Design a protein around this nucleic acid. Structure first.
Length: 85
RNA sequence: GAAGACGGUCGAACUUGACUAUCUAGAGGAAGUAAAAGUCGUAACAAGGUUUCCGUAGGUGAACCUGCGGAAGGAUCAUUA
C-alpha cells in the first residue's frame, strides 16, 4: 500500500506537495505538523478523490518526501513510489 | 697554631601540598559572523493590501503571530457641530 505523493505546481512556482497513503487513524496533526516544521514548506490535508485523502505539502517535494518518509512512523522504506508531478 | 669539632645564625637547594597571576592542548557541543545569485513560508519598503515600530510576556515550519502599555520617525500639524 504505497503512500503516493504527487506534487502539483500552479504558477512558475505555486506548488503543493500532497501525501497520499497516510491512514486517517494517524495524528491528523503529526504527519503534517511534523512536515511543515521540517524542510519547511506549507503542508495540509485534503480528501482528493482520484486518490482518497491526500496530504498537500507545499512544494516539488519529491526528494524531500523520499526522506520525510525514511523518517516519522506512517508507512515503510520499500513502499517508496515516486512519480513526480 | 691546621684538620676536625659543640651549638647557633644567614640560608642556596631539594621533596609534598596550598595560593595567586599569565599562557596554552582538547573528542564534541552551541553561538555569532561572512553571506552574499539556494529552500519554505509573508512576520513588520506603496496604507506592502493585518499602518509601522518600542518595551515585555506567551506561542508558532520558517519568515513571524498575538495581548498589555508606549511612539510617529504615519496614512492626521485641520473639523469647522
Amino acid at each position: 500500500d504505497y503512500i503516493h505523493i504527487r506534487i502539483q505546481q500552479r504558477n512558475g512556482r505555486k506548488t503543493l506537495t500532497t501525501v497520499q497513503g497516510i491512514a486517517d487513524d494517524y495524528d491528523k496533526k503529526k504527519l503534517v505538523k511534523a512536515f511543515k516544521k521540517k524542510f519547511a514548506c506549507n503542508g495540509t490535508v485534503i480528501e482528493h478523490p482520484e486518490y482518497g485523502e491526500v496530504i498537500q505539502l507545499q512544494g516539488d517535494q519529491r526528494k524531500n518526501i523520499c526522506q520525510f518518509l525514511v523518517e516519522i512512523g506512517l508507512a515503510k522504506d520499500d513502499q517508496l513510489k515516486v512519480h513526480g508531478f
